[model samples]
Target chain A: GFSTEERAAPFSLEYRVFLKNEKGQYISPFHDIPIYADKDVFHMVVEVPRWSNAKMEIATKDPLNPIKQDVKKGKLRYVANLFPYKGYIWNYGAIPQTWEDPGHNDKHTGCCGDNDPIDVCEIGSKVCARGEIIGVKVLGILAMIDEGETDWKVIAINVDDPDAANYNDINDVKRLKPGYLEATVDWFRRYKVPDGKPENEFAFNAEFKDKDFAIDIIKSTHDHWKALVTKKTNGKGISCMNTTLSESPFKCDPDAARAIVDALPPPCESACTVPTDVDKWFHH
Target chain B: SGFSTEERAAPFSLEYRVFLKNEKGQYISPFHDIPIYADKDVFHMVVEVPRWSNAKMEIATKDPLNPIKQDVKKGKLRYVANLFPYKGYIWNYGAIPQTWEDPGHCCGDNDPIDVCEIGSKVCARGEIIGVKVLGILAMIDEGETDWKVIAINVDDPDAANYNDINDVKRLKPGYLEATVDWFRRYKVPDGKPENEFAFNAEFKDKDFAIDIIKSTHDHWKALVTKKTNGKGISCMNTTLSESPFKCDPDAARAIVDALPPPCESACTVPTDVDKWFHHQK
Candidate 1:
């Protein structure tokens, strides 16, 4: 399990929710968290809850790799409510111990990686908390090509969800969840349009690959992450500071890591109101 | 007339559909072969579904020769639902040829840029005509940047009265709102969410709209030249000599010539095709 330390003020540019391990030592979730909780069960660091609009993500390039709201042009980014669909259609976050190496071009998508941890859309019933790590079963993957970069969205479900067993594969999602996959495709395709960007393209013409294919892609990204953290490849400014991974040259002493977290001010207790426009619905 | 159509086995049916041709009686793709710019300031539009019509028609880029076909959804031919005040399409809706909203672009919708001609005349299916740009509405359909370019037939008597988006608002009150409303809730009846828009459903000016059109045209140029991968879009064309995607005239002709001729009689539409639904939130 993992924990979050909300630093600075909410709804502020300086705000961030830093990740820490069970022992309370600051860790880079992007580099330190294990990809898998168990066999075939992957660890997903939840950044944005389901039906929420804040474009929170793991700050891969930031120190400690804290979860922070994505900022664009100095403004905090919140996704527009695209009609019948709300903020995020699923519990959106990223898989730890995974790096989509921007240098590597995807064979299927014919595009290079997005230079971040592989994204995951948890389809389980519950909306996860920011920085909360949960075990998930890989179902399928949508090869979303954003800005000519390969941004694979791995469809997953919380292992402990009530209907988790029924969703064993991608086809099962099509049969059981019905419009969920289509909505997800629509969600990723147009999410950026409100921000004046074009809709996202997809590889295989927006078809979702099955479970085995998803597992292979995940494993490959995990391999790229191994290269990223162990100094085999460039870190690209992504903080590789960690308390674990004994073989990793970036591993730091526990007290040193603790000192880093202790230096930061405690989480703000007062509520900072979110911008009024965040709740405003956009009608086409 | 620059083009004509030869109906196939099923007139309105989904299977064995009809395709189109150009004035030379040669089979040509409305998407690939037709010229985008009829004049410096005027653009060519391939009218698919005219005003007050029900069947959701569009340029079939996936097919050979790229004919105008009624779109199908869930094994049934799609028909826009009447969201009160508006029945079928509110205007002559079609697509601009030689312009693809490339999914690779930041503003692309993965299809030819859509145009809604606000002219008095109701264009025939597959009618190709020159239209003057007015403005555009940015509709994020199911997450795709579906730009609805507001235009008018250059031959329309009212064409001179409207110069920009503000002209339409001043000359015809509530019409732009109706168009936006129709597009917003059109898919709601089919159990899908209402579409979203950029700039809070506001229509952009003519220059902004033209800039978007120009961008899509550039994307299409990249598509035909093979600089950008043409995914699902059949780049087969008799024209575009410089493009490596240019096909032999006979090869293009053979596709339209092989199709079964128009049906002996027209297929009947559903009786409830005109039924209106006043949906509540």
Candidate 2:
């Protein structure tokens, strides 16, 4: 369901993180974060500080019933965000054989050595405030189809922190702020074959939000974002970046963004990453 | 393991009533009282009482844990002393019937039934309290055979009124002193059943200083005694006779001669007895 113009639209994939404060109020990361595709399912990487008892849920916006309402109203589905890497000039052309090993894998690199970029990214973003490097745990995957649309989406929720510093403080609630990162991809209309071989070059575009907007809400609130992303896809394919980014690549509306962000609270920093790992970073 | 004659010679059966009292500590007839039998594995009648948020466990015994210490301490097993009938009966025979259909049906009677009288008598008489009724319980019957025996006590030191007779209105502490005196009089001879059988008589003998007979039989009978002048009968043909008139002829004769009768009234023969008998003839 992503717009056709954007390159390398997000797969039917989304990640979500949920945090709770002392008041027992839930804060979500998917509410304000933006996805790159209109995936039928999402793959989320979530991190929570310490061992706070909380509930997580996954669901879609269209035909809302039967959603995995783990917390209040969550569901379970598959994720489709991170694509399998083909060989490239900057990052290597072939999909590495040791990709399965966290330490030897090149796609995801960190102080832990080839741990997982998704994990690192998630922990960095989550524990940015608490300063920790937390490991990521895949809670589960989700897939859903839009009731009135033809598109579909998939997502994965990670139970690990993105911030490396908050690896093991045990008593920190890392709260993630709204409007931090945005992902975009490049699109092509037709395929070009060279040397009697089909050369497929998919472009990936990402937007770093300087200000908050509707995109922020979609990225922060996991359930809400899943609904908005999957509303166009009806349980068919992974959402692409073309479905999430604005029609005008650079233009963003502040009022609509604030409304979306306000509707869904951001996850705590401690929930995003562990303190021990995040402490190594000067700026989480 | 089979018990040795010496081990079996010891008091293996014990009988006691377990009931609940309110804050006043008065012996309030609960909706039902539980009858407990202990030898190795203690067995108690299942009682269904109203669920109380909190209630103190009151047992009348010198050592409450003497009967089944291992089960209580480990919390592995629970003595089915009482249960909520609505929740469902743990022991099948202990279940209260849904309707008053037939008196002979398995669960026809209410709480006022001597479910264990026969077993208690067999146990007290030095005979094995067979697993006749317990066999009806499909679950218990299917389980492994272990140390199981019926328990009876001559005197329970943990009785609430152990210190003072006035405290317990039911009976004076020394009421059985004469019965204990009788035991000293009959002093069994070693050749005649070694007082094992004599002890069984002591349970029913009012004259025996340790009146095990009256205590065991009376307590059981009280459970089945309804409102009217009626007697309660349990399995093994043992009956709970509240009044002397309702007692067995032999048992009544023994008790009346041994102890003073409650009333001094002369026995009057009914003139209508001949009319009723002749009419049949």
Candidate 3:
């Protein structure tokens, strides 16, 4: 389990939700959080909720890997709600202790990975809050080819969900939920089209590999993160500062990690209103 | 597994047909004899129009053995018009056997449910391949419902990867859009209205598609069992012991054996088939 300390204000560029472990020591969720919770189950740090539009993600390049909204061209990023869809169709987030190495070409996709932690789409019934770390059962994976990079989207369900026991693999999703998979595909495919960008392409002609294959991909990425944190590969501008992963060369002292957080402005009293444009739907 | 094809008349001709025979060397209707479920969640699809082919080939449901034949409209063999950027059929187009869209049912098309296989390989006409249903496109043909199940061949190299319809959109890129484009305008060149769709033309997921497919299969069962009107459809199956329309094996064999041998050479396609149609929006 992990905890978050709010900083600055929500929905603002200055806003960040930093993560800490049970002992209250600051840690980088991208680096310190263990990937596996138990056996085949894994931990996911939810960054965006289902039906929410804010493109929040773990600030991988930041010092403490806090959850923050993505920005582009001086504007806060909010994904467009393509027609028949309302924001993301699943609880989108990232797996901890996983890194998609940009420098290494993926033999399966023939494209280098997107320089970020491997993403997960939690298909549980409940909408998770941003920065919520939950245990999930891996179901499948989609090879989303974004701008020539292999951006894999792991399909999962919260282990505590009422029907989680029934969904053990990818085909189970197809059997249980009628059109949810199709909608998920539609969401990712055209989410950027409304922003004047071409639709995202997928590898394997957009086929999703099964759970075993997804686990294999996740494991390989975890290995990538291990190499990254140990200075075996270039950090590539990513902040590797953490109070854990003692074997890593970049590990910092607990007091030093605390000093980094103590220096920031204290958590804000109340959140500001989200911009009206963030809720505006794009009719396509 | 011992299915074979025998030609009649000539290819691309009005009288041309490709008859099928079962392992026992008896004529078998592709619609009634071919088992539908190759496995759970997987089905047998009879390829009618191979990818990129111009001829509007289909299962002649009314004929003996439900032979493969070019669709004839106004007494002329039909050839689909090529839309710009697409040659003919964008995918290997076909249908699942043992499934029928009941006219009395909601959005029924009075025919078998259709399939569009988005596999890498081009299938031969009458080739029966096991396919995993991905999703479905519900096109309302005129006033009737025509369901197009988006599927991939199980033996395809990408079969393991393509579990959902989104995989097709992600991997193929622009294929689903092109499918809608192809279906919407394929008949425009014939001066017919563009086809409409259910669910605002939005595709449904595999579960929804499979349920609909199962319902159609039930409708087919009712049709064969005399529970529903045959509507002039040839229920001349060699099997189906409980079916009132089942015919004797020799009776079916005679119907196929009576046809003349196919022409020595293939018939030529119309020179206009290669002409591309660019719609003015």
Candidate 3 Cα misplacement greater than 4 A, ranges: B1-281
Sort all candidates by DockQ, best to worst. 1, 3, 2
lDDT of 3 by residue, B1-281 (tens): 43777778878877788877777777778899888988887799988988768899988877766888888889987888756445578788998999999888557777789999977676788778899999999898888778999999898766999988888777766678878988888888888898987788777889998999999999999998999988878888987888887899889768876887778887667656744455544
lDDT of 2 by residue, A1-284 (tens): 11111111111122232222233232222222232222322223232221111221222221111112133123222111111100110100001001112112111112112111121123122211111112232111111111211111111112332332333221121123111111111101111111122322221212221212212222333332233343432323211122123532322344432333334433233222212211110100
How well is each residue in A123-163 modelled by candidate 3, as lDDT tens digits?
Answer: 87676788888999999999998998989999999988877
Per-candidate DockQ values are: 0.01, 0.01, 0.01
The local distance difference test score of model 2 is: 0.21
Off by over 4 Å in 2: A1-25, A28-284, B1-19, B22-136, B139-281
For model 1, how does the per-residue alpha-carbon lDDT over B91-130 read when each residue is reduced to its tens digit?
8899998888988854567889999997767678878899
Candidate 1 Cα misplacement greater than 4 A, ranges: B1-281
Q: Is candidate 1 or candidate 3 better by lDDT?
A: 3
